[PDB]
């Protein structure tokens with residue numbers, strides 16, 4: 032009757048514990064008004080993008096592609112210094128990827144029209160690592176927890192970079208507490 | 212250049228900038244330094260100077276009056292003046308109209324459409340608001356599938 | 372359990388001030404009816420027991436190492452590279468500088484990842500492994516009385532934990548691990 | 552001519568008691584500070 | 587929250603006021619951080 | 629039916645003595661027009677803030693963190709307002725209070741007991757008898773601390789002296 036994550040609040044009714052990472056954490060009750068399938072698809076997309084974002088912010092500080100355009104340890108500066116045409120190309124490619132991966136069903140009214148469509152399952156398993164039922168549940172839980180951790184880490188990284196004005200590794204190695 | 216002069220190199224534009232800055236400085240001369248009025252007037256001067264400099268570099272054309280003029284004929288050198296801004300409008304407006312029409316149909320197929328139109332079903336309304344981002348292809352799909360245009364024999368009309 | 376009911380098990384309270392919690396069922400070695408905060412209700416007993424054994428073993432090794440360092444016994448050639456300082460903190464910093472502590476960290480972490488983590492995961496998934504069991508008895512000292520050895524290990528490790536903490540803080544205050 | 556560029560982040564820094572003033576160094580200094 | 591109160595908040599004038607206040611804030615903040623934009627920058 | 633606390637005042641109808649620390653004291657009849665559960669949640673939030681404030685005053689007088697300037701508890705308010713730490717404490721209290729709003733709505737719906745946030749990390753209230761005794765103790769200490777924190781702050785404002793300094 033009570034949520035596992037927040038004991039004093041009641042268990043979210045729409046969260047039945049089937050989904051990975053479900054600890055009954057929905058204090059504001061979004062699941063009541065928004066389909067949990069849509070919410071989980073959004074959660075997985077956010078977590079995946081933030082996994083890649085954290086990896087990129089950490090890696091492109093140490094290894095870069097050749098060229099002055101790509102030579103920027105600071106990630107917010109890389110955003111501007113990288114070739115603008117290339118960035119627009121990435122945007123267009125992301126759009127085409129969304130379209131094809133979602134199979135033209137990219138809206139809240141048609142995304143899950145097919146009963147086969149499952150939240151977050153875009154048909155992406157190039158090496159077929161998810162075909163093992165024994166490890167599939169563990170992999171799902173790991174993916175959700177990784178997405179959550181990476182979301183928090185990416186937010187922290189972006190804002191600490193706004194504050195310090197230095198890369199993440201550089202900040203941690205040469206830390207200077209905020210003064211005004 | 213079309214029929215006017217670039218605004219970055221116009222004595223009229225420079226004179227207007229000078230007049231604005233001088234008005235602000237005259238207003239500032241009567242306030243102590245560091246007081247909120249002095250800081251506000253200084254920020255106003257900075258904003259005026261930044262606006263004039265940005266207008267100069269934007270490539271805007273200026274007439275004898277010293278004010279930027281817009282060339283809304285289709286010229287690609289002045290697209291940012293009407294066409295790209297207007298494309299952003301058309302995008303947003305088609306979004307609004309498409310989602311509103313979708314909600315009208317959703318309420319039409321309900322127990323109490325009038326209740327749904329005065330007291331809204333905001334989960335479904337937000338659903339449609341989300342859908343509205345590909346309204347061009349969606350609207351054309353509706354048109355070609357025949358769900359958009361109604362037949363002449365199915366729309367009420369007055370007698371001749 | 373060795374000396375069940377007298378040394379350990381149900382109905383054993385090393386500190387009668389606090390009541391033996393019902394969660395402590397006397398099934399785990401080292402169960403002397405001490406858990407005033409009732410962590411045993413919610414914690415994973417096997418995981419926490421393995422944690423206790425690991426803490427105790429590291430603390431015992433640390434006590435031996437600190438005592439040798441303060442006594443001044445050094446391996447041949449250690450003094451030339453690191454130094455002749457007896458202070459534990461100076462020794463730690465010097466070894467970190469040279470690279471000794473880094474290699475120890477690397478290999479301890481490798482052992483953790485390849486042995487302790489898999490073993491702990493299987494034990495928590497119900498392998499039946501005794502907490503703190505790695506099969507490391509080359510000299511066969513535990514064949515005679517494994518349960519007696521287990522209780523002795525747990526208690527010696529607890530005492531070593533407390534002693535090592537005390538020694539570090541004594542070194543902080545007086546500059547001596549003894550603190551006399 | 553066009554090669555991936557590897558830049559070492561550590562340089563000569565150390566997690567503690569190093570020339571570089573790290574986050575751990577900041578926390579230690581703060582705990583040992585004097586008003 | 588009471589479902590009746592939520593329906594009241596879903597009533598047309600409340601939603602119109604909230605949505606248009608949100609839009610006004612959007613435009614005001616856009617003009618506060620990017621002022622005097624008489625043109626799309628190209 | 630007169631109140632146990634005040635013999636000459638009639639027992640408030642809503643106050644039936646079920647709640648801890650209920651001695652029939654409500655001369656102005658807030659319980660008559662307002663929900664007693666909401667009022668009790670307010671009471672316990674106030675009292676918890678006040679008890680923690682008293683302990684904070686004392687611990688700040690005796691000890692201050694090495695990285696913070698040493699100052700009297702009241703002055704630390706204005707100091708941290710400008711420093712930015714007060715902003716952080718306010719933001720995080722607000723973050724917890726956002727979920728407090730949901731807890732309050734559930735309390736109105738009857739799914740929770742006022743002041744009962746299921747916060748027993750050390751498992752000190754497992755047995756009923758001790759739980760009821762602890763609840764009476766909590767309400768008593770809450771009220772006493774609510775009085776005492778006002779006493780502390782006002783005495784500092786008058787004497788410009790910390791309470792420990794003043795007591796001698």
Ligand code: CLA
Nearest residue numbers: 293294296297298300301302303304305306307308309311
């Ligand atoms: C900040 C600037 C600004 C502001 C405040 C407005 C404000 C307005 N515009 Mg807009 N407009 C602007 C810039 C601006 N415009 C620019 C730059 C352009 C040039 C592209 C236009 C072009 C434009 C058009 C073409 C129309 C408006 C209309 C309107 C009014 C109603 C819009 C509406 O109900 O949308 C909510 C959306 C709907 C109700 C859905 C139906 C209507 C939209 C506009 C259809 C969009 C898609 C459609 C396929 C476009 C076909 C256009 C073609 C026939 C020419 C509103 C007062 C409308 C008007 O006055 O109608 C009497 C209108 O039809 N505007």
Ligand SMILES: CC1=C(C#C/C(C)=C/C=C/C(C)=C/C=C/C=C(C)/C=C/C=C(\C)C#CC2=C(C)C[C@@H](O)CC2(C)C)C(C)(C)C[C@H](O)C1
Nearest residue numbers: 082083085086156157158159160177180181184185187188
């Ligand atoms: C799925 C799949 C595949 C795949 C795949 C792939 C590519 C998987 C990639 C996974 C990745 C990149 C995961 C990254 C996770 C990052 C995390 C959790 C970061 C957390 C950061 C934190 C907490 C932080 C922080 C911090 C902050 C903010 C403050 C700082 O001062 C400190 C710190 C830095 C610590 C393949 C291709 C193999 C095919 C297969 O058939 C299917």
Ligand SMILES: CC1=C(C#C/C(C)=C/C=C/C(C)=C/C=C/C=C(C)/C=C/C=C(C)/C=C/C2=C(C)CCCC2(C)C)C(C)(C)C[C@H](O)C1
Nearest residue numbers: 653678681701702703705706774775776777778779781782
């Ligand atoms: C302003 C400000 C701040 C502040 C602040 C704060 C936190 C101010 C807090 C003020 C407080 C907590 C005042 C409390 C007053 C309590 C009274 C008068 C109780 C009377 C009880 C009685 C009479 C009980 C009677 C009892 C009753 C009824 C029944 C039993 C018998 C009897 C004994 C008779 C700072 C510090 C942040 C500084 C900043 O610059 C801004």
Ligand SMILES: CCCCCCCCCCCCO[C@H]1O[C@H](CO)[C@@H](O[C@H]2O[C@H](CO)[C@@H](O)[C@H](O)[C@H]2O)[C@H](O)[C@H]1O
Nearest residue numbers: 098100112113114115116117118119120121122123628
């Ligand atoms: C391969 C054949 C595919 C045919 C389909 C192509 C359709 C659309 C192509 C659009 C033109 C390509 O877009 C391009 O414009 C940008 C303008 O800043 C270029 O930007 C840059 O490009 C060059 C380097 O690659 C530099 O020499 C230019 O100085 C620089 O402007 C990018 O090269 C690319 O982003």
